[PDB]
Design a protein around this motif. Structure first.
Motif, PDB file in Angstrom:
ATOM      1  N   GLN A   1      -8.715  41.039  57.812  1.00 22.42           N
ATOM      2  CA  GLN A   1      -9.083  40.749  56.689  1.00 22.42           C
ATOM      3  C   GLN A   1     -10.540  40.737  56.202  1.00 22.42           C
ATOM      4  O   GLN A   1     -10.977  40.347  57.214  1.00 22.42           O
ATOM      5  N   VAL A   2     -10.209  41.213  55.267  1.00 18.35           N
ATOM      6  CA  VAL A   2     -12.195  41.549  54.802  1.00 18.35           C
ATOM      7  C   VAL A   2     -12.490  39.894  54.990  1.00 18.35           C
ATOM      8  O   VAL A   2     -13.858  39.901  55.498  1.00 18.35           O
ATOM      9  N   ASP A   3     -12.127  38.916  53.760  1.00 16.00           N
ATOM     10  CA  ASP A   3     -12.372  37.374  54.360  1.00 16.00           C
ATOM     11  C   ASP A   3     -11.632  37.004  55.666  1.00 16.00           C
ATOM     12  O   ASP A   3     -10.803  36.566  55.594  1.00 16.00           O
ATOM     13  N   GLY A   4     -12.721  36.946  56.932  1.00 18.01           N
ATOM     14  CA  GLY A   4     -12.301  36.138  57.304  1.00 18.01           C
ATOM     15  C   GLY A   4     -11.851  36.465  58.666  1.00 18.01           C
ATOM     16  O   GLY A   4     -11.703  36.037  59.739  1.00 18.01           O
ATOM     17  N   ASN A   5     -12.171  37.754  58.454  1.00 19.66           N
ATOM     18  CA  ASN A   5     -11.119  38.757  59.628  1.00 19.66           C
ATOM     19  C   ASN A   5     -10.455  38.856  60.162  1.00 19.66           C
ATOM     20  O   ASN A   5     -10.309  39.038  61.696  1.00 19.66           O
ATOM     21  N   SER A   6      -9.171  37.995  59.549  1.00 18.84           N
ATOM     22  CA  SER A   6      -8.058  37.036  60.757  1.00 18.84           C
ATOM     23  C   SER A   6      -6.991  38.586  60.259  1.00 18.84           C
ATOM     24  O   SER A   6      -7.182  39.024  60.147  1.00 18.84           O
TER      25      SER A   6
END
Length: 242
Positions: A219-224
């Motif tokens: 994920q771009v947001d949070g790199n999960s």
């Protein structure tokens, strides 16, 4: 079916175009590939693909115009130039493409060595060069002189099919692995060396020729980490021995 795919899915497809002289010299090799990305849920619209590259062939890589070129170059991540932008949903995007064009024989994936000799005896062998590949449904098609009956098959690795109308001998398989790199076929039929060319090769591999894979998606947001699936295919446009 979408039911067989993760909500993030990539088709990685390569095609080869290759022409070889019967001497074994490489006249032309062209390899084209691309990664096609398909997302079925806007939940995964803002992601980055992690690309693992173990290739040493000097393949030229080109990112999609919407894709951050420097990000790919420095970090081998595929992401949009505008991280806040989303990838399309239920629409294929060619996020990455590559190309190799070369005349270095060293890059031939599968060499073919056909030796006619004069009451003609034909001896033909293959050898797998890239131990990475696993080639299935390999068919080596050999043209035959007409009007002189069927070829008489001697020693053979694999099986064959003789077609009287097409005047061909199709040489099929054995599976070509790094453990089983080579095999040969011998037959006889009344003809001249040039009757047995051009030799055509057909196969389909589920491993890419270029050692390029998507190993992770985040994920771009949070790199999960994010579940993803891939479909990888390596196909032949042209593979001929002149």
């Amino acid at each position: 079916s979408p039911i067989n795919m993760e909500s993030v899915h990539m088709k990685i497809e390569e095609k080869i175009t290759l022409t070889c002289g019967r001497d074994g010299g490489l006249q032309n090799m062209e390899l084209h590939g691309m990664i096609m990305l398909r997302i079925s849920d806007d939940k995964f619209g803002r992601i980055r693909l992690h690309v693992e590259n173990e290739d040493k062939k000097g393949v030229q890589l080109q990112t999609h115009p919407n894709v951050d070129k420097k990000l790919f170059t420095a970090e081998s991540l595929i992401g949009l130039k505008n991280p806040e932008k989303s990838f399309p949903v239920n629409s294929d995007v060619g996020v990455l493409k590559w190309r190799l064009q070369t005349t270095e024989e060293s890059f031939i994936p599968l060499t073919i060595n056909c030796w006619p000799s004069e009451g003609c005896d034909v001896n033909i062998e293959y050898e797998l060069q890239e131990d990475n590949l696993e080639l299935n449904d390999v068919v080596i098609t050999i043209p035959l002189p007409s009007g002189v009956g069927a070829p008489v098959i001697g020693e053979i690795d694999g099986e064959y099919r003789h077609d009287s109308r097409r005047n061909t001998l199709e040489w099929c398989l054995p599976v070509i692995d790094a453990k089983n790199k080579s095999g040969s076929l011998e037959f006889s039929i009344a003809g001249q060396p040039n009757d047995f060319f051009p030799v055509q090769v057909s196969f389909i591999s589920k491993k890419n020729y270029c050692n390029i894979q998507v190993t992770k998606v985040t994920q771009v947001d949070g790199n999960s980490p994010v579940r993803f699936s891939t479909e990888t295919t390596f196909l032949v446009d042209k593979y001929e021995i002149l």
